[PDB]
Amino acid sequence: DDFAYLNARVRVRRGTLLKESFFQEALDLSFADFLRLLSETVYGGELAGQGLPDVDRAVLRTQAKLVGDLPRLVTGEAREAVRLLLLRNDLHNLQALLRAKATGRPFEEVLLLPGTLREEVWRQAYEAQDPAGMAQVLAVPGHPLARALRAVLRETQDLARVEALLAKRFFEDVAKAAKGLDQPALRDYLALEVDAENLRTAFKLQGSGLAPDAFFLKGGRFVDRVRFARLMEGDYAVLDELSGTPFSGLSGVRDLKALERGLRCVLLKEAKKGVQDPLGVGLVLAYVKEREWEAVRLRLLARRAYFGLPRAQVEEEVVC
Amino acid sequence: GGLDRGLIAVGMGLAVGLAALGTGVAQARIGAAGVGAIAEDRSNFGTALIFLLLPETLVIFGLLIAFILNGRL
Amino acid sequence: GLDRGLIAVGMGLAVGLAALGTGVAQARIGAAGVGAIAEDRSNFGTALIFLLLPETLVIFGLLIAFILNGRL
Amino acid sequence: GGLDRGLIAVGMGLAVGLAALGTGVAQARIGAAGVGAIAEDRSNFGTALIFLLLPETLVIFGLLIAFILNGRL
Amino acid sequence: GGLDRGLIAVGMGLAVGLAALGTGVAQARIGAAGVGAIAEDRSNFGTALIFLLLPETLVIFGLLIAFILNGRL
Amino acid sequence: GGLDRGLIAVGMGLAVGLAALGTGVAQARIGAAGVGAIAEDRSNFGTALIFLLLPETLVIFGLLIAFILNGRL
Amino acid sequence: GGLDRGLIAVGMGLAVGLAALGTGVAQARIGAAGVGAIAEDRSNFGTALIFLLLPETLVIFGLLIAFILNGRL
Amino acid sequence: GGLDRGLIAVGMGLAVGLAALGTGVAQARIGAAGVGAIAEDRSNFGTALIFLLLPETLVIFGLLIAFILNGRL
Amino acid sequence: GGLDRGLIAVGMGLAVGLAALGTGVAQARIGAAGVGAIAEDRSNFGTALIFLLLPETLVIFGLLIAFILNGRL
Amino acid sequence: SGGLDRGLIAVGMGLAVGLAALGTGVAQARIGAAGVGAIAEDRSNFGTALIFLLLPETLVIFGLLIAFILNGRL
Amino acid sequence: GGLDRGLIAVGMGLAVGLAALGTGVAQARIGAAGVGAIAEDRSNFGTALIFLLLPETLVIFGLLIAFILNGRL
Amino acid sequence: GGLDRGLIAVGMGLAVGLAALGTGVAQARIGAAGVGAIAEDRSNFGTALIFLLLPETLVIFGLLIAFILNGRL
Amino acid sequence: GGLDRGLIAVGMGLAVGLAALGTGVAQARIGAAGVGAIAEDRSNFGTALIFLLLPETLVIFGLLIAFILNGRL
Amino acid sequence: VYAFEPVDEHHEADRIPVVLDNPPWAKPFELLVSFLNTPKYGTFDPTPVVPVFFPFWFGMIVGDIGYALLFYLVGRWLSGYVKRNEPLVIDLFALKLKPQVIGKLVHILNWMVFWTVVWGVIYGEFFGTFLEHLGVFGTPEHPGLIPILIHRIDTAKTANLLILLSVAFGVVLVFFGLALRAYLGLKHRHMAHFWEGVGYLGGLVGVLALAASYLGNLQAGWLQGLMYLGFGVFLLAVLMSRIWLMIPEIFTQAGHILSHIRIYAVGAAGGILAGLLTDVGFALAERLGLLGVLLGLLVAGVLHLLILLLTTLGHMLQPIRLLWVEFFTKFGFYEENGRPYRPFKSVR
């Protein structure tokens, strides 16, 4: 309820963050210097021993300890708004869980990376008679995933096309909840995220040549459906047509790796404007996205120190 | 005739009540932020108490004006 | 016997708006205190002190009401 | 000489009503946070009830001022 | 009778109305959180009803004050 | 001659108006949460309707106060 | 004479206006959530309209009190 | 036959003003949700127009009470 | 004339001011959602203007009530 | 030559103008907030934002007309 | 006149105060969005200051009304 | 003087009070955005202080109106 | 004191109370942002306290008007 | 080669460290001085004005001699704790304090309580109103003992003089801060801040002169050229600066000068509260029965201790907050925060 009581702990968490020089010093190490620098970091409290999977589990536990509490301790419309921040991990968990349910593998075979719901609910949802019953088992009061499963559940029982329409309706329900919320910053942030995801899907569907109207979604502000068709076709001039929008440097780039890098850079630049509202909820989402970018960069530095990647090999990964 | 002391006391009471309302309106957000800071860490309790005590001057000036009106009463 | 009721009406408005401001502070105070208590049991006394900090407006309103009653 | 008992009753009623308004303004967020905590866990329902019952002193003081006015009436 | 009866009646009416306003302001977010908890689980419906009915003490005190004003009228 | 009837009518009118204002202030958030629960599913429609109609007790008490004022009138 | 009749009309007007204010403040978030549920699906307009029409009883009771005032004057 | 027409006119003015205030208070969230649904889908304009026009009953009752006041005037 | 004309003008002014307040209260959220839709799409200006101008009926009715009051004046 | 009605008419005209300006400012708050957000988004719909901002002035114009009618019939 | 000038000054002061209240209510969100845009870039300070000064016309009209009241004082 | 001087003082006091209320209502969001920009960067203090001090012209006009009332007093 | 002194004290009390209300309304958001900045870092506390104490000229002008009313009485 | 080269000049001293270097009589206020940031290493050290004025304003704040005796008892308890040489441990406060900070706090409490007992003798108030029983103050309504300079109960002869004393203290502090800012600008040879301080002083002087002329008393002949010269000096410094430090800045400085009456306000409020509590307790004890004076005096002491624990923190904080808001901000004290003197540790 109180958008400032959580923001106080958010500012206290934002005071405890690694500097850019901590990543600049990580460009020259031997993973033992990186282990010692991680032992001095705030994430090092979950650091058990030495090794790449131990460091990965420590980074995951540190992210769950530093970001997972913000999904808790919230109430009402503030809780419903903050629920639409850590939604991608639970969506991927539910997607691979539905894929395993359609596959028939063991319930302990899945990894089940941390989301926003109870893990015992995900364990009980491994065996269910109907997918609507599994959604009712996984039903929270304000989670949009349960309502999206109830909406898209009137197609079949369990299909891969049902999972694709579930992901599309999950993005559409995120956009609808952003339209239905009183927050001038998070709505535009989610709209830019949806538009960048649509552009990434247009890049990832290049060469398929199928009907993009089924592939495209709704909710974006910088892209058009004719622009989506021109991006589905081999027309990088439409990518040059994105003038004035957040896709400023994103122009004429045919490389999908560079396209996703520029998309992540534009997303981090848009989330860096989240410090403008010090009384709302956008600063907490900005701190969450900054911790996520720092954790992805820490995992990249850990992989580079493990397998001996050059600093030139990671120079395209520390631009922002 | 006898409509002076009651009106003066009514104005002083309106002053004290609206000053207490404004002081509580400030103290709501002040104490909410201070309690969130204390729940974040137990290291800035005095700095939060400083922000909690910074807003009492409005109610203090209201009580001073009420005492001045009572001296006029 | 005309201004005798006006002073009582002003004292009543004073005590009522003082309790209104005290409850307006105590809303966010008790909200943050209950959120801290739901976070951990180790933050009970500081939250109780922060909740009790709002009683000064009620004390000043009761003092003004006692001053008006002595004037009454 | 008349026109004083009704004014004192109106003042006591304004006191009781605005004290109930402030107590309700506190108890709104109090009961909302308590219901959220009880939905979280049923173990801390007693501390939630104590925090909810802590705002009753405003209504108690308003009833005391109304009783003092009724004694004056 | 005269105007003091109507003045005391107006004071009791303003008391009851502002007390009901404060009671509804308390009941709003409390019933919102209770309906959210009932949508979460129907097991805590009794605690939800208790948290809903807990705010009516201000209404009971306002009804008592209005009855005292009617008895003094 | 006397404005006692108009004064009692003004008091009962302020009573009924502020009581309906508080009832509507409760019913806004109550019906928002209940409409969210109904849009979730039709499984708990009865308890949601009970929680919606639960705010009518303050309006009933205010109507009793207004009927008592009319009987005094 | 011309002092008692206009005050009753003033109180009836204040009652009707505050009742309409409370009814609109209730219906605002209710209609917002109902339009959200209608945009979610074109199948739940009935319970949405029921929850919308549920706030009309306060305005009906206020109109009944105003009709009682008009029967008095 | 003194301050009667002006008092009845002041009451009808307060009635019409607070009724328009409540109608606008409903219409704010109503038109916000309706514009959000219209931007969501052009096919949802009719239900949004119905939800917008549903709030006019308070203005209709206020105009009826004001016409009753003018007939009393 | 006396004093009924000034009170009638005061009530008409209260009507016009509170009706404009309610119209602006609706038009705030109306224009906010309309500007959001206009920045979203340029093909929604003709409906945003309709949603904005739909709230002017309260101001028009208040102007009509003030004109009826001035004609009574 | 009103003695008490002349003050009451001026008080009513002042209350009308003040509450009309309050409603116009309450509208223009969210109006200018959304318009400034759109202008910081892009410098393209500044004229439409100005039109949406100036659309609220009809209430202030009607309140000023009511005050002018009160000053004329004073 | 010992009653007309004070009432006219009260009306002019209420006009100026409520006009400044509405101007500040606009300027709050206006300056919030303008300071956000200025923290975004310094290239948009002119239109931001223009939108900030756009609320001054209501205060100018209120000052003109107060000057007309002082001329009629 | 007599009834005119105290009424002019009440009008000047209501003017200054509502002007300070509107100035603080602007200054809340103004100082919120300014302190947010200051926590963003310490080099934007000039435009933040300019936007903070821009809203004091309404308080200056209210003080001028109160000084004109005192000169009339 | 008669009618002039009580009404002058009532106006000074309304001025002081609403000035304290506006000052606390600004100071709530100001102190919330300042406490957030202090919990963010213990390096911008000076500018935070400066911007916090900047919302005091309204209370200073209210104390000045209160002294002017106490001297003019 | 131990090269003891000199420090930098008034310009270009950025990485240079900073130290207090104050008198040992004023060494105890170092924690309160260093609660904020550091100066510009060539900025005026304002720590002496803290011990000059915060005790003098704090004695005017709290004038209860019984509260001074309770403070002396608590200081004796803290002195015994410091003589025990144990660390001050408060687990619910999470406050671990060394004996040096506790000894500095005890010395500051003694230096506060001396002037506090002096002003309580000036106010004639011991534990609230103990003069209701034995009239140690001498009033014309009831002469019990020697006369009080301030009766501290009525304000008909006290409020104007108290407001004048608070306004004179605030104006003197504002003038001292403006003079210190102008002297530091002349020392650093930065004529912008020097002209700004001179113009702010002239505008404040002209504002006070025109206010005392128009809204104050009669005889508007002597200060007419004073107000004209003040407005002219303000306009001339505005032309000499052209920095748009407008009438908003002058009004903010004037409000910071006029905010010193809050000390007299809080002192009168605490005195009225303590006098009302003590009068109600003494009345319900002696005049109501004269035998429940034990239980009545116990309840009165409990209520007085509760009111003291509720209000004395803010009553002590408001003077130091006003000092930090006036003497620092009038002299600047918000530029670059200084660099700390961090030598080699040898933590031992």
mmCIF file of C-alpha atoms in Angstrom, chain F residues 2-38:
data_model
loop_
_atom_site.group_PDB
_atom_site.id
_atom_site.type_symbol
_atom_site.label_atom_id
_atom_site.label_comp_id
_atom_site.label_asym_id
_atom_site.label_seq_id
_atom_site.Cartn_x
_atom_site.Cartn_y
_atom_site.Cartn_z
ATOM 1 C CA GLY F 2 -39.421 29.504 15.599
ATOM 2 C CA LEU F 3 -36.966 27.773 13.260
ATOM 3 C CA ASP F 4 -36.782 24.619 15.400
ATOM 4 C CA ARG F 5 -38.303 22.470 12.647
ATOM 5 C CA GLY F 6 -35.872 23.829 10.060
ATOM 6 C CA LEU F 7 -32.948 23.344 12.443
ATOM 7 C CA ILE F 8 -33.948 19.746 13.214
ATOM 8 C CA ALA F 9 -34.413 19.131 9.486
ATOM 9 C CA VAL F 10 -30.959 20.573 8.765
ATOM 10 C CA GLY F 11 -29.435 18.372 11.459
ATOM 11 C CA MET F 12 -31.162 15.226 10.199
ATOM 12 C CA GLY F 13 -30.147 16.174 6.664
ATOM 13 C CA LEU F 14 -26.484 16.572 7.594
ATOM 14 C CA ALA F 15 -26.762 13.254 9.465
ATOM 15 C CA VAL F 16 -28.230 11.350 6.510
ATOM 16 C CA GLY F 17 -25.868 13.004 4.034
ATOM 17 C CA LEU F 18 -22.667 12.286 5.943
ATOM 18 C CA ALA F 19 -23.889 8.760 6.748
ATOM 19 C CA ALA F 20 -24.529 8.071 3.059
ATOM 20 C CA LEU F 21 -21.142 9.629 2.263
ATOM 21 C CA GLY F 22 -19.394 7.259 4.666
ATOM 22 C CA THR F 23 -21.406 4.293 3.388
ATOM 23 C CA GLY F 24 -20.417 5.156 -0.174
ATOM 24 C CA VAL F 25 -16.789 5.689 0.834
ATOM 25 C CA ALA F 26 -16.772 2.164 2.255
ATOM 26 C CA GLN F 27 -18.737 0.746 -0.686
ATOM 27 C CA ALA F 28 -16.315 2.172 -3.282
ATOM 28 C CA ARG F 29 -13.293 0.118 -2.202
ATOM 29 C CA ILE F 30 -15.529 -2.776 -1.102
ATOM 30 C CA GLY F 31 -17.182 -3.006 -4.513
ATOM 31 C CA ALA F 32 -13.847 -2.545 -6.271
ATOM 32 C CA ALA F 33 -12.393 -5.558 -4.446
ATOM 33 C CA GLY F 34 -15.622 -7.511 -4.927
ATOM 34 C CA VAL F 35 -15.741 -6.715 -8.640
ATOM 35 C CA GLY F 36 -12.146 -7.893 -8.931
ATOM 36 C CA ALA F 37 -13.110 -11.106 -7.140
ATOM 37 C CA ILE F 38 -16.153 -11.559 -9.395
#
